[PDB]
């Protein structure tokens, strides 16, 4: 199963979509939601010329170097004319509460780039009301050293010579889904091994499991972004089996904690939650017309 | 102290030398071009009371240094000193100025000079100079004396304080701040910085220390240090205190310093003369040698000498050398300098005068003041490179011929005065510098030919209330009015035959259309005034399209630089790509602040996005769908929407009135004030330790605590009035000012609970609810928005912002900041005053006269000064830069390659074409931003077969369109080879 689904997708991890129309006022019409839209219209300046030269070198390596796998993979799609304007899919690895998700990101370079490092912004927040990580705030910013400009360390900056965009797309499904979540904050990992600890590890994982299953997987099937759109399809075809036996043991082992006592009504909440969402998860699944 | 007038000029002299200048009465003799310049800026600097003297007579002579003079009084032959005396009061009426024509000779009797507080000195002979500062000095307290002079292109300048004086300030620079991490209990004590940020001191300095655990004996001490290391220092014993726990901030102290000057005839042995170019460090010395031989020459023969007549030169030579040997370190006698100076004696260069001018007002501030160091002991200013490129020239060209450019033709002669007359100049910004350059064309008679010359300047700014205090062109009856117009009917009237077309278009990529390459063409120079980085960047890639030489200069508070560009000659301004800068982390700005700055970016911030982005999105939202029954049925189906939450939200609570406003403040307070920190010590308890066991609340993290609302409290009443104002305004809820007592707000507030600190079927019902209660009506589907506006007194935003900045400070226990130190960080203010402006202008219309002549590469300098220490400092301008990039072939900045083709050509025919002329085959186009030929990504295979004009979709008006390309390395995996920009033209 592995090999074909490695197989299919390896056609698409890398394309290009139209999503800017100019008319004959030089305006620009956008034909999808896009975070940066100001910057985009309000930065004509066409004296940047490094930036396409560091651009156009980087399409060579994001062509054959991104990550494919089934647990992870990465997919990109880029402007038909502009070379500022890129979209970033990432599936949640295995094992981990973001298992089989469906996460997206704007990516917008400044003029002076690669002078300073470019922009990226989570979309995939379901309207601001859920926080998916301690770095990924529930406004959208991602915050990684590597992408920051501050007095902390000479290795820990965007150096112009080295830095690349594909160690940024790395480090980001490297660092921040990982399989505890909950320890990523500094300041808990003095409490690792207590049962308190534990607990409340337990209780940001349900969360975190509810969260994704509704605004990772059952949106972005009823709506998913028209860049995107057959891959994400052709995506979920393929492992309907394996996201129903993945949501039934999270099903299973979130109600081995509901006699608790402290955390008991948290997670009979959050139980009620993912069997509602699962519910309808699976009829969207059976109804989905085969690629 | 009206701030609307000094509100750039406090933020760099301060609070109390405003108060020290004053009651301060300045005497200024001699009202030459000098003078005037000297009187112009101490008026606008804000001097109580200005007393100016003279005893000549106003000649045709003087129109062409005085630019206050006119026709009529020089044939009323009036005195110089009343003539101006009106005009210069209509600068600023603050300030009381008086005139006087007492005789000066060795008899005149000094003792009313003791009534002054500083003499200047101008167009004076050196024994009367000598006897005054003899008296001067004498006095109980010392009055200071300034002595200056201008002679053709040479000028001298002197400074003396009496034989002790006193400085508050040595260099003005704010004390920094550093994190103590380690001390020991040794003798002398260690001191070890906090991990990297190096505390960038130097031994001798002082520092005092608080908030120390453990070692409580060195809190509110004082030591001096000795540095170690860039990251620690020593102190000195402390074996005998208590174990350093951890913690500890240190800030530096400033201390009084005292200098000594000496007397003017003892001075005049052995100078202690600046160095300003170091290039050739034993100048002022010979400078100084024809200076004085020049004096003693026009006391001998009670005239100056004249031009071309060599016995006058040999006359003067022989003083000099005669003199030389006198002087305490017997230098040599510089033979052209003493030519030199004999062949222009009896010139006046305006743009020298100028700058001296500056640095002289400069120079009394800080005698009234004490503020910055002042300037020991001597400088000398000079620009013989205008004439060293000159060579031999004839005698005849700088004779007078009778008119107003007498002056000027006698410095520099007739031919380059012709060639300024017929110059076409682009100036952009009306600035502070641009009404000085104004002023300088128009003494130089810039583009004053009728066959030929134009200047056009642009702005699209209006006249401001603080404007006035720097920019002397405008008045206050020229508020809310075009800069542009008002500078050029300004102008207009100092020059009559000037000749200037003044626009209002603000230079950006959109009005490019006005701006085409033939309007560039038409031009011969290019000044910029400009104050943001992307403008200057924007306006040098336009020049550097074109081949046309570019100024540019700035100024920031006692800081300035100017750079020149020409071309073929010197790098542009974009070889120079700066460096980045310290932006806040998003932890530090959010819930860890540790100074001022970032409690006032977090208010700044709140402010915007309370009062700016969420009305746009709310009436976004609502007009996109025309009726809230329509969302409630499309939510009821399932649709998905964007915000739908945040809108639904703030439709919910909606205030309806007055009261419901004062409430909404109140939780508004209570939310920011009280729940958020109760929230953060819930997460993270005091005492949680890291691995290694340290605090978590350590340095710089400080540890919140809440704030209970107290309506007696002047903060809380401030904060909770301006809130309530500015949402009555946002939701457009009318209301009085009486509302705004306390008492009305303690009625209001009495029936008010508070809530304890602790989806989509509550967003359904709350819209339901709504849509019943006929809430959902077109009026209420409106907000408006607001726009930060820190130039308005009664708007109430840096009210709000200083209230919610204080507050929050005080939550985290950091010193709280007043009302104008938070309007200049939030508005970004650039501190500025007038003698920087007027120098730096000075030395920018210095420099255009080298431009317009077109010296050799090592006539052209660049200047780097800071008047607060004082230096100056002048550098060859940077040379081109050879690049090649394969086969020997090399390119420069200047370059431009060039490809002709026809209607039917093609992208492969284009490649071809470069291939075969340059030699080197191209792997990349891109037109700008926009992509043409790609190989690497998928489609652009089949682009090779398609016909330029359709590729790049061109506009009727161009004839050509610029390309970038690049090449293959010769060396695969390396980056491609950058290239030249390739200009394509359509058709022959
Ligand atoms: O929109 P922002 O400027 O980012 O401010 C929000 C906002 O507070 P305000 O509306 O009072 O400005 C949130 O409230 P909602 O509008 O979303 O209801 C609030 O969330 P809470 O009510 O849960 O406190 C959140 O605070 P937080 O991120 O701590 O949840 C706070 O963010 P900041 O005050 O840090 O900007
Ligand atoms: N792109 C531009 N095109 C034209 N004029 C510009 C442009 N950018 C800035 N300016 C002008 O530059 C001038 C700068 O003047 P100056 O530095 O004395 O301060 P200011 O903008 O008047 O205001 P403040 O002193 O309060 O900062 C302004 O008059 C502004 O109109």
């Given at each position: ?291 | ?651 919910s609570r909606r205030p309806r009135n007055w009261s419901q406003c004062v409430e909404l403040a109140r939780l508004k ?55 309530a104002?500015?949402y009555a305004?946002?939701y457009?809820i009318?209301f ?12 209001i507030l009495?029936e008010v ?236």
């Amino acid at each position: 199963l592995e090999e074909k689904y490695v197989a299919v997708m390896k056609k698409l991890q890398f394309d290009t979509f139209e999503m800017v129309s100019e008319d004959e006022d030089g305006k620009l019409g956008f034909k999808v939601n896009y975070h940066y839209m100001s910057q985009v219209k309000n930065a004509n300046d066409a004296n940047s010329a490094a930036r396409a030269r560091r651009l156009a070198q980087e399409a060579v390596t994001l062509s054959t170097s991104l990550p494919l796998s089934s647990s992870s993979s990465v997919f990109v799609r880029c402007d038909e004319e502009r070379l500022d304007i890129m979209k970033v899919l990432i599936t949640g690895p295995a094992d981990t509460p973001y298992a089989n998700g469906c996460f997206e990101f704007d990516v917008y370079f400044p003029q002076d780039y690669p002078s300073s490092p470019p922009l990226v912004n989570l979309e995939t927040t379901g309207g601001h009301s859920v926080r998916f990580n301690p770095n990924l705030y529930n406004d959208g910013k991602v915050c990684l050293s590597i992408l920051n400009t501050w007095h902390g360390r000479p290795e820990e900056k965007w150096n112009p010579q080295t830095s690349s965009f594909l160690q940024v797309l790395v480090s980001v499904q490297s660092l921040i889904l990982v399989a505890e979540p909950y320890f990523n904050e500094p300041g808990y990992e003095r409490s690792r091994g207590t049962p308190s600890g534990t607990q409340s590890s337990r209780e940001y994982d349900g969360n975190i499991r509810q969260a994704t299953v509704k605004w990772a997987m059952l949106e972005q099937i009823r709506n998913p972004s028209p860049c995107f759109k057959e891959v994400i399809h052709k995506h979920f075809y393929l492992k309907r089996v394996e996201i129903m036996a993945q949501c039934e043991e999270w099903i299973a082992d979130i109600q081995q904690y509901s006699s608790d006592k402290r955390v008991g009504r948290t997670m009979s909440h959050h139980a009620a939650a993912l069997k509602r969402h699962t519910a309808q998860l699976r009829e969207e699944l059976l109804k989905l017309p085969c690629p | 102290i009206d701030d609307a007038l000094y509100s750039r000029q406090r933020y760099v002299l301060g609070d109390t030398a405003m108060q020290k200048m004053a009651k301060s009465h300045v005497f200024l003799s001699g009202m030459g071009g000098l003078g005037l310049e000297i009187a112009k800026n101490l008026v606008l600097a804000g001097i109580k009371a200005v007393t100016i003297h003279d005893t000549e007579k106003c000649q045709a002579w003087d129109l062409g240094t005085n630019f206050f003079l006119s026709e009529d009084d020089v044939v009323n032959k009036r005195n110089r000193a009343e003539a101006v005396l009106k005009h210069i009061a209509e600068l600023n009426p603050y300030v009381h100025v008086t005139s006087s024509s007492v005789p000066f000779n060795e008899t005149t009797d000094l003792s009313f000079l003791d009534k002054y507080q500083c003499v200047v000195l101008t167009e004076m002979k050196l024994p009367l100079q000598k006897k005054i500062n003899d008296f001067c000095r004498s006095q109980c307290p010392p009055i200071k004396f300034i002595s200056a002079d201008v002679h053709g292109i040479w000028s001298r300048l002197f400074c003396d304080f009496g034989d002790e004086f006193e400085v508050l300030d040595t260099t003005g620079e704010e004390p920094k701040e550093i994190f103590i991490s380690n001390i020991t209990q040794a003798n002398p004590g260690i001191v070890t910085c906090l991990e990297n940020h190096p505390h960038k001191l130097e031994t001798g300095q002082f520092l005092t220390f608080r908030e120390i655990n453990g070692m409580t004996g060195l809190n509110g001490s004082i030591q001096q240090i000795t540095v170690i290391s860039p990251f620690s220092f020593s102190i000195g014993d402390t074996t005998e205190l208590e174990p350093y726990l951890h913690g500890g901030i240190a800030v530096q102290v400033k201390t009084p310093k005292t200098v000594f000057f000496e007397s003017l005839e003892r001075q005049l042995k052995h100078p202690k003369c600046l160095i300003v170019d170091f290039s050739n460090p034993e100048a002022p010395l010979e400078i100084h040698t024809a200076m004085l031989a020049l004096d003693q020459f026009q006391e001998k023969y009670s005239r100056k000498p004249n031009v071309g007549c060599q016995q006058d030169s040999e006359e003067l030579l022989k003083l000099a050398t005669s003199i030389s040997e006198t002087l305490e370190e017997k230098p040599d006698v510089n033979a052209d300098i003493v030519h030199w100076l004999s062949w222009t004696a009896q010139g006046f260069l305006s743009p020298l005068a100028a700058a001296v001018g500056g640095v002289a007002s400069q120079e009394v501030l800080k005698a009234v003041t004490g503020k910055f160091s002042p300037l020991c002991q001597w400088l000398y200013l000079e620009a013989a490179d205008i004439v060293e490129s000159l060579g031999k020239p004839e005698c005849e060209e700088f004779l007078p011929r009778g008119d107003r450019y007498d002056a000027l033709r006698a410095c520099i002669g007739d031919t380059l005065c012709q060639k300024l007359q017929n110059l076409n100049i682009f100036l952009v910004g009306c600035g502070a510098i641009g009404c000085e350059m104004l002023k300088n064309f128009a003494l130089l008679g810039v583009g004053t030919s009728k066959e030929k010359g134009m200047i056009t300047v642009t702005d699209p700014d209006l006249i401001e209330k603080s404007n006035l205090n720097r920019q002397f062109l405008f008045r206050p009856h020229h508020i809310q009015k075009p800069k542009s117009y008002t500078a050029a009917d300004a102008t207009l009237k100092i020059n009559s035959q000037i000749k200037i077309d003044a626009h209002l278009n603000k230079v950006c990529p959109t009005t490019e259309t006005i701006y085409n390459d033939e309007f560039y063409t038409k031009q011969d120079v290019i000044i910029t005034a400009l104050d943001n980085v992307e403008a200057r960047r924007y306006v040098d890639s336009r020049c550097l399209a074109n081949l046309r030489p570019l100024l540019d200069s700035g100024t920031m508070g006692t800081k300035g630089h100017t750079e020149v560009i020409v071309p073929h000659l010197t790098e542009s301004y974009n070889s120079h790509r700066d460096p980045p800068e310290e932006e806040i982390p998003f932890s530090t700005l959010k819930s860890f602040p540790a100074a001022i700055e970032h409690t006032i970016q977090w208010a700044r911030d709140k402010f915007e996005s309370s009062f700016s982005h969420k009305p746009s999105l709310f009436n976004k939202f609502w007009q996109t769908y025309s009726s809230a029954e329509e969302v409630l049925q499309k939510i009821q189906s399932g649709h998905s929407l964007e915000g739908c939450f945040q809108v639904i939200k703030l439709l919910s609570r909606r205030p309806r009135n007055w009261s419901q406003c004062v409430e909404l403040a109140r939780l508004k307070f209570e939310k920011y004030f009280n729940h958020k920190a109760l929230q953060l010590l819930h997460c993270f308890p005091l005492d949680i330790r890291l691995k290694d066991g340290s605090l978590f609340w350590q340095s710089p993290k400080r540890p919140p605590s809440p704030i209970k609302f107290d309506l007696n409290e002047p903060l809380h009443l401030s904060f909770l009035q301006n809130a309530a104002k500015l949402y009555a305004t946002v939701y457009c809820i009318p209301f009085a000012e009486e509302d705004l007592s306390a008492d009305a707000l303690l009625n209001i507030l009495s029936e008010v609970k508070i809530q304890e600190f602790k989806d989509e079927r509550n967003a359904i019902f709350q819209l339901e609810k709504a849509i019943l209660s006929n809430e959902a009506t077109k009026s209420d589907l409106q907000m408006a928005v607001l726009s930060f506006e820190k130039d308005d007194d009664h708007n109430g935003h840096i009210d709000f912002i200083t209230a919610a900045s204080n507050l929050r400070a005080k939550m985290y226990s950091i010193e709280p900041a007043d009302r104008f130190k938070t309007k200049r960080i939030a508005g970004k203010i650039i501190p500025a005053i007038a003698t920087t402006t007027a120098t730096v202008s000075g030395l920018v219309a210095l420099e255009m006269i080298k431009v317009t002549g077109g010296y050799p590469f090592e006539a052209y300098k660049n200047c780097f000064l800071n008047l607060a220490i004082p230096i100056v400092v002048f550098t060859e301008t940077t040379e081109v830069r050879k690049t090649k990039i394969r086969n020997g072939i090399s390119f420069t900045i200047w370059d431009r390659w060039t490809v002709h083709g026809k209607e039917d050509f093609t992208l492969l025919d284009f490649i071809n074409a470069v291939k075969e002329k340059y030699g080197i085959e191209p792997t990349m186009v891109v037109q700008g931003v926009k992509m043409l030929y790609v190989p690497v990504m998928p489609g652009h295979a089949k682009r090779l077969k398609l016909t330029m004009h359709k590729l790049v979709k061109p506009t009727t008006e161009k004839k050509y369109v610029d390309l970038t390309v690049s090449f293959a390395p010769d060396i695969d995996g390396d980056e491609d080879l950058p290239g030249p920009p390739v200009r394509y033209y359509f058709s022959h």
